[PDB]
Design an enzyme around this catalytic site. Structure first.
Site, mmCIF file in Angstrom:
data_model
loop_
_atom_site.group_PDB
_atom_site.id
_atom_site.type_symbol
_atom_site.label_atom_id
_atom_site.label_comp_id
_atom_site.label_asym_id
_atom_site.label_seq_id
_atom_site.Cartn_x
_atom_site.Cartn_y
_atom_site.Cartn_z
ATOM 1 N N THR A 48 27.936 7.520 32.042
ATOM 2 C CA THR A 48 26.592 7.064 31.747
ATOM 3 C C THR A 48 25.871 8.056 30.790
ATOM 4 O OG1 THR A 48 26.621 5.633 33.677
ATOM 5 C CG2 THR A 48 24.521 6.110 32.693
ATOM 6 N N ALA A 73 22.652 0.920 39.421
ATOM 7 C CA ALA A 73 23.008 -0.139 38.493
ATOM 8 C C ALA A 73 22.312 -1.388 38.780
ATOM 9 C CB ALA A 73 24.492 -0.345 38.384
#
EC number: 3.4.25.1
Lengths: 195, 244, 53, 222, 231, 212, 52, 249, 237, 244
Positions: free
Chosen positions: F1, F49
């Site tokens: 990420t 998420a």
């Protein structure tokens, strides 16, 4: 970080707040500010815990502002601090607190006099000729009680803030990126930048 | 014969407030709607009660979402509540299904709303003190049936019409729709038909500060025609009857 | 009521008598409709009496 | 004390094709080291050429197949016998999961069917909420065994043309409905010999433009 | 007289009048005819448009995968009760994995209409449903009266000119019970039943809406050109 | 990420990675971390998420009922300030969040906001959020320029995620770049990182610590 | 006939014949007799399509 | 259910509040009761009344103790007094005996029961109470004080007054016999004398219920040895004791 | 409470709305005319009764924000109930989306309040009608709306509400031109003052004028300024 | 049926108007007279009791003068029971604004709060009005002495001098002929006794039917002192003005 200072001089309240925000393990903005106008001659600088600061800044703002259109009457800085404290006390007792420290610096129109109030997250106001919060507060205090005179002019309060700043750069184990100074005079709230 | 209820009958078997409610659609100002094969046209007599009225910021056409539009007639304060609910409703379905809601399914939600007066009973929480008295012409386009035009009543029943008028000029308007309509008309010939029937029951002058047109096409979505295009179209009706 | 529409016709001529006109206009009937219908709607028998009918 | 989530193992495999779709799983149910059931479906048809399996902890995993079909029902009722898309259903599953987020479900859901273009589509959800479209995604406990072998025979992952040494990657091709039976049967053959929560039985549902086919194969009986 | 204003006030004739009034909503309503054999139930409804430009209003609402209902009263009233029946049909599949009995579903329906007619600030529901279904003791036809009262019949009607329909069913009574397995014949026997409730309105491919349920046929609604073989 | 965005003269370049790990195990390599809120807004995915994917579809629900009521397109500052107050409620239920709402309007210019679980909202000019936000800053902030072309900026966004992707455990898969303009976002497509790398090793002549 | 009195039932007989009388028929028809039930009853404003 | 949330006291059209006017009719139907304020006590007085002689008067009560320093006596309806005495004891504990730890002053308690009055001259599904109370008492700063709480919900401080069916005649007798020094024993002779002219039925020490709010009796305190507290000031007079003062006329 | 006090009429109305309209007419009179760059709401203020204060007695036109002014005619008691909500919604706007209100939006909200009280159980509807005026922020087009008890709002180029509103509006058809507003702010004051002296009369001691110029300039004129415009107009005429 | 017994206190008449607020004011015209004059150095408040009796304790009565807060006292004229409630509300609210802002509550704030409360009952709830009329005498730094009257409609208007209760027309006319802008409390003391003397229904006005209080800035140290005069000083000041 969280550095806010107050130096009350005899014609002006000088609030200066930090230009750095740190969330996570890096600095995200190094060009920021952390102050909201309450009144057109009442200025509140706020700092302290993550995300309580913005949300509690604007809550209080909606409220002082509501009164001030409604009655087209400014509040006393004295009045203003009582309200802020009232809210802070209540939140310790309620489910969700707000851990935020505020200096409310204003120039009263009624008496023509600066007044500086220091409110902690617990909610105790106490009137001060000068005041601070956090661990930053420690470094600064000892200078204000040496060199302060209650007969100061606007410029003298500015030149004093340079010593406080110069000290902080040296001792402070963390970055903070200078300060935007704001002077609460009787004409407006006017911004200058300290070097 | 009696009326000292709030949600009561009626020797006939209709609800009583509802019966009165339908007769306040005779105090509307017209919304006319022709649905053809290429789209649905909505026009309305906008009304000016004075010429010191700004009449171009009063509008009685409102977009529900891109592909469903609506024309409202009757009392417009009532219409304020229902159109909000409609906006909300369309949005919920795009949330829950990421799908453009059907027109029918949309209509069906808003009819369930029109019956919710009472003193608080049933399974549907009454909070209205009296029923609505505004009728809607839900226009729209779905990918299941193509172009569709519905007439939603403050009764709580909904029918898909090919052409309908509602308002004060209903009778004189639907007597004409009957004769002049056929199965297929192309879209700019539909727009001129709206302006012809709106002209017979007109109590003013047909011009662009007191008539508004709007379409719904699949490709362009819901567009409310600017005064520049509404003006042009008006001028081509006085020209086309002038060859007859 | 057909009785209101009578008052409309009588008042359409009354506005001709007042204007010094002898043949009616669409304009005299508009004036008539506004005064009879708006003014005397406060005083309408229709509303109270319908409750029995 | 009450520890309200356990596990029942199982392993599932969803493969998106190009004119069909494959959602498969084993039929073994366990608790700890004891085999509870040799046979027990997890791959339920919901109609409309959607197959769902909410695989993992069984008690949650039956709750989201109940609640899911209940909404297939109430959709068909209030939209005049509308055909439930893969798109619609996916976003709806998202809401059903996400709504419990202070007391989450602890299952791994995967759906499969055709999308609206006459190709396969597989969406796979984490227990919390989110989803993404797939071409392979295993789940369950022997996921990490079965997934990387499917990325090497479908997507041709890190393979180059022979004797080009890195110049040009190997070309992708279309896989027949027949071929994909072999891929799924072979993964679970290898899986059984190396994992102790998979075996007994394998139930592949294969989804086409004519209906849903169940096709049952045995595995090793431990 | 003064007894007609509310749902709480008896009434010197033993009645309450408002429920009596709501029963006249069924009479001003359009006809639907039900008839059943020992294996298939049929609802034969005549749909009604307003004007020529108008559509026809759906009169048969599929309530479940083995139940269908048909309205003959207020359209808004029918929408409330239909949800309530779906709800209790789905609560039975979820909790007890049981197809909701037809005989039990008339009793569930029953009490929802009684509790608003006993109450102040409520009203009776002015709609009668004919409810068909095929459960574990076979075909059933329920007539729900807006009175709350449920009765189980071999063939009935409600609507306007409905009496003329009960008679067609009354003649053809011993015939239709004995034809089983042959849904073609029941349907035709029900089309002819609803045709003696005409008075210059006819039947077409947009008037006639048939729905059946069988032993061997789950719930099917035929409309369009699928009621064009069965005029 | 690692997801970054920078204002320059054209608008904002958004740049995201697609590697969504579960830890040691790499869950999927094709997870989109861009969320089309409407045609004039994109939201990045960071932290939980599930929390970001959900609530920014649901911001799309408040974008379309802002749009209708006011019959004017939403402010970027207004968009941010819906979302802020929502995550403040669920604070102390411990839901995690890391989003940058990016938008460009004609009545305010390019404006980025960073909405965070705390209730913290900071506007700005450069941000990078993720579990490799530190790598990304380095390259991007040295080679920063306000007065930059659309062509140079696209290569600069790519390159930044690349650097992060190479050392970061949890970054990779593919990168996706968007260029938000006034008139909408334009997609610049999907580039593999593992294939981008060798192109950029020859052409630039970077990475002399990496075998080859 | 439901909650008709025997005076109301006499009323339906006469009413039936009047409707025949208009048509010009020499007999009363079955169609006309029912039509007379509906005319004796006060509700004869009939459908408005809020019973469909 | 409840759907009665509309006031049944409504404005009458030529002015006045119709329910409160009516309820004052119902006050003047009932027994006759009076109070005389001295300089060291207040005396209150009423007549008992039964259906038949078969009723006992021993278990009957019409003068009640609200606090030991404050008593009440009514004229009007029996039912309404009965509940309103109990609501008076309740608010007197709940709002001054839990908050300031002691019994409330006479001005304060009067003010609370006028607000009990007020919330049945208003609100739905209620009509006014049909009593008028004298609430006599002693507090430490307004002295001995006599009040009249009424169906309106007003209060008036008084020095001697009467309520009930013989109210008109009673107060004229009392206007002319009042004096600006009375002792409590001298107060009694007035109140008995007046109440004798309003009775025409039987007269006894068992049929006149008489109460004094004199001065403190430690024999009703119940205990001895905390000198901080001083016993019931309220003291209902037994039948034997009343009878002597009757002969004393 | 829960009983309906607004009920459907056998005509096509609700009697409480027609009645509420009758209520606005029995009130005092407020006039609205917008210039090229000003709104002017002027209102008739009583003085039948004397010894009335001027400083502490509330005005007919109450500033909601720094740029949205509201005037009201009908019941002077009720008025304050619609305004208390209107002020709090303006601060909520600032909070949740940022930017201060647009005049169109506040008018739509105020309309929604009266709309609701025409159809909620246990309320009568407000007998009060507004001229809500102001500027959009960062714009300078004058905005003048008027909402009424139905819950319907209309924008107007010029309008008048309260007693004898038909008589005043007739005047305004004949002197205010839709095409060319009064050329400056000062010409616009002479128009509102010219209108008022028809019905109000009885000196310049009754006439109040609030003038707003763009960029948050609210000024309420002094009795001396008013006299001056009344005198000029009397003399010219 | 419950609906059968509903008053409907709170619909309009055909006039546009509220029967029950009109009637409330009708009954306050019965009630006791109260006049307030705002001098330029005080406010004199004086009210004449509607009842009197010689057995009635009238020496420590204060059933017309009630103090809301340290700097704001009111005179009462109407349904005293209804007033006792709102006086005790007012006292709660006045003390509240001081608790939270640590600032003396302005006259304007307390007066507007009380008005809106009356206002709630004519607006909704199906309840009768609170028929109370208050004259507020109050001090604030900002606007000096402030004088105010509130009605059952829940509307407030400023005054310099005003009279409510019985004989309103009579009292109002008298104040106006005498009132000057240059008056101190002494002139005000004389006028307040004097108007009351002309509206009186007793053969001569006496002290036992007068209640009387002032608020003077002429108390020491530039502080506002609320004084409710004792009846024996009122009798004294009544000898000074030569009324008796």
């Amino acid at each position: 970080m969280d550095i806010i200072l107050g130096i009350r001089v005899q014609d002006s309240v000088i609030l200066a707040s930090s230009k750095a925000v740190t969330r996570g393990i890096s600095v995200l903005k190094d060009s920021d500010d952390k102050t909201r106008q309450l009144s057109p001659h009442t200025l509140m600088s706020f700092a302290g815990e993550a995300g309580d600061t913005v949300q509690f800044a604007e809550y209080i703002q909606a409220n002082i502002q509501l009164y001030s259109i409604r009655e087209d009457y400014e509040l006393s800085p004295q009045a203003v601090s009582s309200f802020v404290r009232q809210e802070l006390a209540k939140s310790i007792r309620s489910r969700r607190p707000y851990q935020v420290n505020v200096l409310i610096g204003g120039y009263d129109k009624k008496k023509n006099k600066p007044e500086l109030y220091q409110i902690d997250y617990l909610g105790t106001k106490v009137e001060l000729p000068y005041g601070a919060h956090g661990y930053s507060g420690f470094y600064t205090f000892s200078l204000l009680d040496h060199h302060y005179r209650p007969d100061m002019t606007t410029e003298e309060g500015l030149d004093l803030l340079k010593l406080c700043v110069q000290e902080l750069e040296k001792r402070m184990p963390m970055d903070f990126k200078g300060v935007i100074v704001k002077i609460v005079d009787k004409d407006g709230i006017r911004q200058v930048d300290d070097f | 014969e009696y009326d000292r209820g709030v949600s009561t009958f009626s020797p006939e078997g209709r609800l009583f407030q509802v019966e009165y409610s339908l007769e306040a659609i005779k105090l509307g100002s017209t919304a006319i709607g022709i649905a053809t094969k290429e789209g649905v046209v909505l026009g309305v007599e906008k009304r000016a009660t004075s010429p010191l009225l700004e009449s171009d910021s009063i509008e009685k056409i409102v977009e529900i979402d891109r592909h469903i539009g609506c024309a409202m007639s009757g009392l417009t304060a009532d219409a304020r509540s229902m159109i909000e609910h409609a906006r909300t409703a369309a949005v919920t379905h795009n949330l829950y299904y990421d799908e453009d809601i059907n027109v029918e399914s949309l209509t069906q939600s808003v009819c369930d709303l029109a019956l919710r007066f009472g003193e608080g009973a049933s399974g549907e929480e009454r909070l209205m003190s009296r029923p609505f008295g505004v009728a809607l012409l839900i226009a729209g386009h779905d990918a299941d049936d193509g172009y569709q035009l519905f007439h939603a009543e403050p009764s709580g029943t909904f029918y898909r019409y090919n052409a309908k008028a509602i308002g004060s000029g209903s009778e004189g308007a639907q007597a004409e729709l009957l004769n002049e309509w056929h199965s297929s008309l192309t879209l700019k010939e539909a727009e001129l038909l709206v302006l012809k029937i709106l002209k017979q029951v007109m109590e003013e002058k047909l011009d662009e500060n007191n008539a508004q047109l709007s379409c719904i096409t699949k490709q362009d979505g819901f567009k409310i025609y600017d005064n520049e295009k509404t003006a042009e179209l008006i001028k081509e009706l006085k020209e086309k009857e002038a060859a007859e | 009521t057909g009785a209101e529409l009578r008052s409309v016709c009588t008042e359409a001529g009354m506005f001709a008598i007042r204007a010094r006109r002898k043949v009616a206009t669409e304009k005299d009937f508009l004036k008539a409709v506004d005064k009879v219908i708006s003014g005397y709607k406060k005083f309408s028998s229709t509303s109270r009496y319908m409750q029995y009918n | 004390q009450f520890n309200p989530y356990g596990d029942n193992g199982g392993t599932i495999l969803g493969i998106a094709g190009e004119d069909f779709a494959v959602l498969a799983g084993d039929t073994r149910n366990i608790t700890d080291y004891s085999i509870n059931s040799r046979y027990e479906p997890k791959v339920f048809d919901c109609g409309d050429n959607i197959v769902m399996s909410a695989n993992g902890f069984a008690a949650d995993g039956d709750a989201l197949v109940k609640r899911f079909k209940n909404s297939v029902k109430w959709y068909h009722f209030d939209h005049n016998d509308k055909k439930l898309s893969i798109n619609s259903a996916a976003r709806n599953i998202q809401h059903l999961l996400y709504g419990k987020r202070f007391f989450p479900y602890y299952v791994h859901t995967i759906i499969a069917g055709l999308d609206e273009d006459g190709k396969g589509a597989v969406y796979s959800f984490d227990p919390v909420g989110s989803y993404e479209r797939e071409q392979c995604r295993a789940g369950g406990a022997a996921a990490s065994l079965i997934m990387p072998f499917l990325d090497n025979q479908v997507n041709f992952k890190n393979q180059y043309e022979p004797g080009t040494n890195g110049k040009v990657k190997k070309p992708l091709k279309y896989l027949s409905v027949e071929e994909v039976i072999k891929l799924v049967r072979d993964s679970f053959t290898s899986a059984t010999e190396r994992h102790i929560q998979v075996g007994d039985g394998l139930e592949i549902l294969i989804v086409t433009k004519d209906g849903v086919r169940k096709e049952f194969y045995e595995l090793k009986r431990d | 007289n003064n007894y007609d204003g509310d749902t709480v006030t008896f009434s010197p004739t033993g009645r309450l009048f408002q429920v009596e009034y709501a029963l006249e909503a069924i009479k001003q309503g359009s006809v639907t005819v039900g008839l059943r054999s020992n294996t298939h139930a049929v609802l034969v409804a005549l749909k009604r448009n307003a004007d020529e430009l108008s559509s026809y209003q759906k009169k048969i609402i599929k309530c479940d995968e083995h139940m269908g209902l048909s309205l003959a009263g207020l359209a808004p009233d029918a929408r409330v009760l239909s949800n309530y029946l779906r709800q209790q049909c789905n609560y039975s599949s979820l909790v007890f994995n049981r197809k909701l009995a037809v005989e039990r579903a008339g009793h569930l329906l029953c009490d929802k209409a009684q509790k608003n007619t006993q109450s102040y600030g409520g009203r009776p529901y002015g709609v009668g449903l004919l409810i068909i279904g095929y459960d574990k003791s076979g075909a059933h036809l329920l007539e729900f009266q807006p009175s709350g009262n449920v009765t189980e019949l071999y063939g009935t009607a409600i609507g306007a000119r409905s009496q003329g329909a009960k008679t067609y069913l009354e003649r053809t009574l011993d015939t239709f019970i004995k034809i089983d397995g042959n849904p073609d014949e029941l349907i035709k026997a029900g089309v002819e039943a609803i045709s003696q409730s005409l008075r210059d309105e006819s039947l077409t491919v947009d008037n006639l809406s048939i729905a059946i349920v069988g032993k061997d046929t789950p719930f099917t609604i035929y409309d369009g050109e699928a009621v064009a073989k069965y005029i | 990420t690692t997801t970054l965005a920078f204002r320059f003269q054209g608008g904002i370049i958004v740049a995201v990675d697609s590697r969504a790990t579960a830890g040691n195990w790499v869950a999927s390599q094709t997870v989109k971390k861009v969320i089309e809120i409407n045609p004039f807004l994109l939201g990045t995915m960071a932290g939980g998420a599930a929390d970001c994917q959900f609530w920014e579809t649901w911001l799309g629900s408040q974008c379309r009922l802002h749009e209708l009521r006011e019959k004017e397109r939403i402010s970027v500052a207004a968009a941010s300030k819906i979302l802020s107050n929502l995550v403040y409620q669920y604070k102390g239920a411990g839901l995690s969040m890391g989003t940058m709402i990016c938008g460009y309007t004609r009545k305010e210019g390019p404006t980025i906001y960073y909405v965070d679980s705390d209730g913290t909202r900071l506007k700005g000019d450069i941000f990078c959020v993720g579990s490799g936000q530190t790598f990304a800053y380095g390259v991007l902030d040295s080679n920063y320029k306000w007065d930059l072309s659309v062509e140079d900026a696209l290569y600069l966004g790519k390159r930044s995620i690349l650097a992060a992707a190479h050392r970061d455990a949890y970054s990779g898969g593919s990168v996706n770049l968007y260029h938000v303009t006034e008139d909408g976002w334009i997609y610049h497509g999907n580039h593999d990182v593992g294939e981008l790398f060798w192109k950029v090793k020859e052409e630039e002549g970077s990475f002399n610590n990496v075998i080859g | 006939t439901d909650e008709f009195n025997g005076a109301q039932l006499k009323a339906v007989t006469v009413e039936a014949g009047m409707i025949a009388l208009r048509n010009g028929q020499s007999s009363v028809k079955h169609e006309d007799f029912v039509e007379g039930i509906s005319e004796v009853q006060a509700r004869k404003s009939k459908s408005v399509s809020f019973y469909a | 259910t409840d759907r009665y949330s509309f006031s049944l006291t409504t404005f009458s059209p030529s002015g006045k509040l119709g329910q409160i006017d009516y309820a004052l009719t119902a006050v003047k139907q009932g027994v006759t009761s009076l109070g005389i304020k001295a300089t060291n006590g207040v005396v209150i007085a009423t007549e008992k009344k039964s259906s038949s002689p078969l009723a006992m008067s021993e278990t009957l009560s019409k003068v009640s103790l609200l606090t030991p320093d404050i008593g009440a006596v009514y004229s009007g309806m029996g039912p309404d007094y009965r509940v309103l005495v109990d609501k008076s004891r309740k608010v007197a504990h709940t709002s001054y005996k839990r908050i300031y730890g002691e019994y409330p002053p006479t001005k304060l308690l009067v003010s609370e029961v006028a607000k009990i009055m007020q919330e049945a001259t208003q609100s739905g599904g209620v009509r006014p109470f049909g009593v008028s109370l004298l609430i006599a008492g002693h507090d430490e700063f307004n002295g001995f004080s006599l009040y009249q709480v009424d169906p309106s919900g007003s209060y008036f401080p008084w020095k001697a007054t009467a309520i009930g069916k013989g109210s008109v005649a009673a107060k004229t007798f009392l206007e002319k016999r009042w004096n600006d020094e009375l002792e409590l024993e001298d107060a009694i002779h007035i109140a008995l004398l007046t109440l004798k002219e309003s009775v025409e039925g039987e007269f006894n020490g068992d049929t006149i219920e008489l109460a004094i709010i004199g001065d403190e009796n430690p024999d009703l305190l119940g205990y001895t040895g905390i000198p901080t507290d001083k016993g019931p000031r309220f003291r209902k007079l037994t039948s034997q004791e009343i009878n002597d003062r009757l002969e004393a006329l | 409470y829960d009983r309906a006090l607004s009920i459907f009429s056998p005509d096509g109305h609700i009697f409480q709305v027609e009645y509420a309209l009758e209520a606005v007419k029995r009130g005092t009179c407020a006039v609205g005319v917008k210039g090229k760059n000003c709104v002017v709401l002027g209102c008739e203020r009583r003085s039948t009764l004397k010894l009335q204060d001027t400083r502490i007695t509330p005005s007919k036109v109450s500033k909601i924000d720094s740029h949205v002014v509201l005037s009201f005619s009908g019941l002077n008691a009720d008025s304050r109930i619609l305004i208390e909500k209107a002020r709090v919604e303006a601060q909520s706007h600032r909070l949740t989306l940022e930017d201060p209100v647009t005049v169109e939006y506040l008018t739509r909200y105020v309309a929604g309040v009266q709309q609701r009280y025409t159809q909620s159980g246990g309320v009568r509807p407000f007998g009060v009608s507004t001229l809500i005026a102001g500027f959009d922020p960062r714009d300078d087009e004058p905005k003048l709306y008027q909402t009424e008890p139905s819950g319907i709002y209309s924008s107007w180029s010029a309008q008048t509400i309260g007693r004898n509103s038909k008589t005043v509006r007739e005047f305004l058809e004949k002197n205010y031109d839709r095409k060319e507003p009064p050329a400056t702010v000062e010409e616009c004051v002479k128009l509102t003052v010219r209108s008022l002296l028809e019905v109000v009369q009885t000196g310049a001691k009754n006439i109040e004028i609030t003038v707003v110029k763009p960029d948050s300039d609210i000024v309420a004129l002094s009795s001396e300024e008013i006299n001056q415009y009344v005198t000029q107009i009397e003399q010219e005429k | 049926g419950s609906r059968r017994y509903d008053s409907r206190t709170t619909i309009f008449s055909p006039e546009g108007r509220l029967y029950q607020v009109e009637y409330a004011l009708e009954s306050i015209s019965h009630a006791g007279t109260a006049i307030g004059i705002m001098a330029s150095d005080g406010i004199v408040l004086a009210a004449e009791r509607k009842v009197t009796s010689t057995l009635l304790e009238q020496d420590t009565s204060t059933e017309k003068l009630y103090k809301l807060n340290d700097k704001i006292a009111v005179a009462v004229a109407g349904l005293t029971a209804d007033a006792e409630i709102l006086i005790n509300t007012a006292r709660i609210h006045a003390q509240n604004y001081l608790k939270t802002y640590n600032e003396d509550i302005p006259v304007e704030i307390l007066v507007r709060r009380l008005s809106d409360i009356k206002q709630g009952y004519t607006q909704h709830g199906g309840l009768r009005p609170f028929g109370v009329s208050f004259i507020y005498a109050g001090y604030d730094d900002r606007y000096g002495y402030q004088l105010y009257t509130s009605n059952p409609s829940g509307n407030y208007t400023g005054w310099k001098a005003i009279s409510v209760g019985a004989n309103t027309s009579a009292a109002q006319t008298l104040l106006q002929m005498d009132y000057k802008d240059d008056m101190k409390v002494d002139d005000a003391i004389e006028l307040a006794l004097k108007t009351l003397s002309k509206t009186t229904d007793s053969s001569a006005l006496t002290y036992d039917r007068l209640e009387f209080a002032t608020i003077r800035k002429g108390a020491n140290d530039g502080e506002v002192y609320q004084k409710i005069f004792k009846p024996q000083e009122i009798k004294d000041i009544l000898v000074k003005t030569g009324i008796t």
